[PDB]
């Protein structure tokens, strides 16, 4: 019940590198380095990473492509990060014409 972590990307702070000291912020850091490493980029352990690229070029409305991609995203997330509890996914247009937002919730 005492799990602590450093920022996956060492981010400068007044004291030095940022440190996260709780049971809920540790999950935040873990999911933060996830979505930042695409699959296969890790030199060791090739089967660990993200599947966000496949969202890139598709209509922002609802289509079967999105319903396809969400299942792969959730299954990969369960495989890579088993301990963290994840509740859902929401994709929707935001800001300008091109942009799209993906939100993952930890509850």
């Amino acid at each position: 019940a005492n799990n602590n972590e450093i920022d996956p990307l060492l981010t400068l702070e007044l004291s030095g590198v940022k440190t996260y000291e709780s049971q809920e912020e540790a999950w935040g850091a873990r999911l933060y380095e996830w979505l930042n490493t695409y699959q296969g980029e890790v030199y060791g352990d090739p089967s660990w990473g993200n599947v966000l690229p496949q969202f890139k070029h598709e209509p922002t409305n609802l289509s079967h492509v999105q319903i396809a991609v969400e299942a792969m995203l959730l299954q990969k997330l369960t495989v890579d990060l088993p301990d963290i509890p994840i509740s859902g996914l929401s994709v929707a247009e935001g800001d300008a014409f091109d942009k799209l937002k993906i939100s993952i919730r930890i509850r």
């Binding site: 996956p8 990307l9 060492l10 981010t11 400068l12 590198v17 930042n36 490493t37 695409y38 980029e41 890790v42």
Partner: peptide, 9 residues
Amino acid sequence: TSAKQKSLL
């Protein structure tokens, strides 16, 4: 990884 290459340390 491409994310860590842009971090200085």
